Design goal:
The structure is cut from a larger assembly and holds two copies of chain A (about 50 residues). Chain A has helices at about 20, 35-40; strands at about 10, 50. Chain A is of the alpha+beta class and about 50 residues long. The two termini of chain A are about 15 Å apart.
Chain lengths: ~50, ~50
């Protein structure tokens, strides 16, 4: 979806295994805020608005 | 009429449609038979710190 029509799909009741998403494209900007993605893998959260 | 359409319909469309439990019916609509029965579906509803 375009930037003017960005989706909002909260992920819950399932696993967002970050290991699968760590290797998805040749290059990307994993500009996570607050905690590092490596530490974020060992960081469970209530509800993630994707 | 036995289909799911034009039903009791209290769920006027809202915004914060949070997690769901679409799964096997917890209320077992058992096929009561052989007489000498009444499905005493005892339900205890409680909210413990949320």
């Amino acid at each position: 979806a375009s930037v003017y029509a960005w989706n909002r799909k909260r992920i819950s009741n399932c696993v967002a295994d970050y290991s699968v998403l760590y290797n998805f494209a040749p290059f990307f900007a994993f500009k996570c805020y607050g905690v590092s993605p490596t530490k974020l893998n060992d960081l469970c959260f209530t509800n993630v608005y994707a | 009429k036995s289909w799911m359409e034009s039903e009791f319909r209290v769920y006027s469309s809202a915004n914060n449609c949070t997690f769901e439990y679409v799964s096997q019916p917890f209320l077992m609509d058992l096929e009561g038979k052989q007489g000498n029965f009444k499905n005493l579906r005892e339900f205890v509803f409680k909210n413990i710190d949320g």
